[PDB]
Amino acid sequence: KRIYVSYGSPVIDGEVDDIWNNVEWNIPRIYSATTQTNAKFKLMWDDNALYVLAEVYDPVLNSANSTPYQQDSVEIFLDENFDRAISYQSDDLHYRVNYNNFKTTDAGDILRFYTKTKLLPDGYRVEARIALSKKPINGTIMGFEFQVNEADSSARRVATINMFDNTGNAWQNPSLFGEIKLKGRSDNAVVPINP
């Protein structure tokens, strides 16, 4: 299915901008296995970028495994041109950041990826910017996926949570991503914001 993304320009600092409160939480509900770990994320776009704000409830944080996706982490997938190819094109993106803000790319220039995290009681927050290369406009559709890796005290991934793909294959297959449609940018810009 499809998430409608509002226009707006958050500050990347791991803090919840006022403007995030005007936008709805998306709840990923596709669990590989049962787990106490849950998550929610909000999206926003501006002329230059896509923005993700993710909160994970996860009582045990682990990143001791040297395999990135075997650490408690979130992953963001983007099919920017909306090709929906069955294998990764050169505009496809697959990014990951752990609760300590350690970033990895599986596909795409990591110079486009800017993140902050914050430890919360019972979990963590990720706040992420992805620089877009196609100038987005109202009505732009992109393919998107969101994933949480849940690791336990044995230093190994024990579960995944996905928004859209239930088949383990988003890392290989962009056609599996869901859809985001960008809306809400004014046609006139601003004028004089009066004092």
Ligand X SMILES: OC[C@H]1O[C@@H](O[C@H]2[C@H](O)[C@@H](O)[C@H](O)O[C@@H]2CO)[C@H](O)[C@@H](O)[C@@H]1O
Q: Is 75 in the site for ligand X (CB under 6 A)?
A: yes
- What are the structure tokens assigned to 108, written together? 């795409």
Report whether 178 contacts 166 (CB < 8 A): no
x/- track of binding to ligand X for residues 170-189 (CB under 6 A): -x------------------
Give dist(CA 58, CA 55) in Å, integer. Answer: 10
DSSP string, 92-121: EEEEEEETT--EEEEES-GGGEEEEEEEET
What does 73 interact with, of ligand X, Ca ion, none (CB < 5 to 8 A by kind)? none
- What are the structure tokens assigned to 126, written together? 């990720």
Residue 75 or residue 91: which is nearer to ligand X going by CB?
75
Give dist(CA 133, CA 73) in Å, integer. Answer: 25
Q: Does 13 appear as a known binding residue?
A: yes
Choosing from 15, 83, 106, 152, the residue that interacts with ligand X (CB under 6 A) is 106
Binding residues for Ca(2+), as ranges, are 11, 13, 15, 17, 58, 60, 72, 79, 83, 91-92, 127, 150-151
Q: Interface with ligand X by CB under 6 A: which residues?
A: 69, 75, 106, 147, 160, 168, 171
